[PDB]
């Protein structure tokens, strides 16, 4: 069983603001959250609203996820009342960017996976790197928009298909066909699946020769977004383990959550 990184954020020494996007950016901060499951267990948090937040961290080796599985698993918070703020993360390849400091909403990615609410639209992004910097989409499904966290899981196989899940109940699954449609460079991912369908099917789309960085690159109105955690492995079990914690902790903190909401306003 083959950890590639395990994000606990007790700080976050290893990811790096970016210097070369050319916008506005806030600071991240490493906090407990309004209400926790665990009192020693820590979240890095969005501090500023209407900018954005840009930095990168390198995994704990260089991969390629030929012939394996590959389960992306994280566990994201919106406890601010989110209208409209993005949530999601990227995977990178080595020859995307020099070092992490060069990333960008532009750079090369692997994947593009999780959670992104604005202006009623609530969808949960699962974008695959085509070619070059084209990118394939399918149409996808809601995204949690509530004040607790929520566990959002994407399984990659290598027989070209993928899982869906979030708080560990499965909510789409299917192979890379013509489901999907190709998205030019730049172009937004709004959730319907609909753009140009004129691309060739491509057998080994699951699969890359390198992951070697993650980012996250999104813009916040009202900030306050919390990643919880992050894990990156191609071993099911071992996924299915530190879910389970996971998601008893989440049962506490709703808890937490249920009992001042209903001591307050
Ligand atoms: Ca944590």
Same mark, same amino acid.
């Given at each position: 069983?083959?950890?590639? @990184?395990?994000? *606990?954020?007790?700080?976050?020494?290893?990811?790096?603001?970016?210097?070369?996007?050319?916008?506005?950016?806030?600071?991240?901060?490493?906090?407990?959250?309004?209400?926790?499951?665990?009192?020693? #267990?820590?979240?890095?948090? *969005?501090?500023?609203? #209407? =900018? @954005?937040?840009?930095?990168?961290? =390198?995994? $704990?080796?260089?991969?390629?996820?030929?012939?394996?599985?590959?389960?992306?698993?994280?566990?994201?918070?919106?406890?601010?009342?989110?209208?409209?703020? /993005?949530?999601?993360?990227? +995977?990178?390849?080595?020859?995307?960017?020099?070092?992490?400091?060069? @990333?960008?909403?532009?750079?090369?990615?692997?994947?593009? @996976?999780?959670?992104?609410?604005? /202006?009623?639209? =609530?969808?949960?992004?699962?974008?695959?790197?085509?070619?070059? =910097?084209?990118?394939?989409?399918?149409?996808?499904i809601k995204c949690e928009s509530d004040d607790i966290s929520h566990l959002?899981?994407?399984?990659?196989?290598?027989?070209?298909?993928?899982?869906?899940?979030?708080? /560990?109940?499965?909510?789409?699954?299917?192979?890379? $066909?013509? $489901?999907?449609?190709?998205?030019?460079?730049?172009?937004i991912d709004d959730g319907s699946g609909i753009a140009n369908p004129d691309?060739?099917?491509?057998p080994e789309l699951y699969k890359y020769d390198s992951f070697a960085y993650? /980012?996250?690159?999104?813009?916040?109105?009202?900030?306050? *977004?919390?990643?919880?955690?992050? +894990?990156? *492995?191609? $071993?099911?079990?071992?996924?299915?383990?530190?879910?389970?914690?996971?998601?008893?902790?989440?049962?506490?903190?709703?808890?937490?959550?249920?009992?001042?909401?209903?001591?307050?306003?």
């Open positions: 069983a083959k950890v590639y @990184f395990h994000e *606990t954020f007790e700080n976050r020494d290893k990811w790096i603001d970016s210097t070369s996007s050319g916008k506005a950016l806030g600071p991240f901060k490493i906090v407990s959250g309004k209400w926790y499951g665990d009192a020693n #267990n820590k979240g890095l948090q *969005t501090s500023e609203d #209407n =900018k @954005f937040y840009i930095a990168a961290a =390198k995994l $704990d080796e260089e991969f390629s996820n030929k012939d394996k599985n590959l389960i992306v698993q994280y566990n994201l918070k919106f406890e601010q009342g989110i209208d409209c703020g /993005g949530g999601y993360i990227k +995977l990178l390849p080595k020859k995307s960017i020099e070092s992490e400091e060069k @990333f960008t909403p532009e750079s090369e990615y692997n994947i593009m @996976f999780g959670p992104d609410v604005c /202006g009623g639209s =609530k969808r949960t992004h699962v974008i695959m790197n085509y070619k070059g =910097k084209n990118n394939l989409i399918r149409k996808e959002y899981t994407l399984i990659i196989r290598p027989n070209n298909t993928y899982v869906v899940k979030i708080d /560990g109940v499965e909510k789409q699954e299917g192979k890379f $066909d013509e $489901d999907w449609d190709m998205l030019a460079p730049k172009e691309y060739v099917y491509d993650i /980012g996250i690159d999104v813009w916040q109105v009202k900030a306050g *977004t919390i990643y919880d955690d992050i +894990l990156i *492995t191609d $071993d099911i079990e071992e996924a299915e383990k530190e879910a389970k914690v996971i998601l008893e902790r989440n049962a506490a903190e709703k808890k937490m959550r249920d009992e001042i909401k209903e001591a307050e306003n």
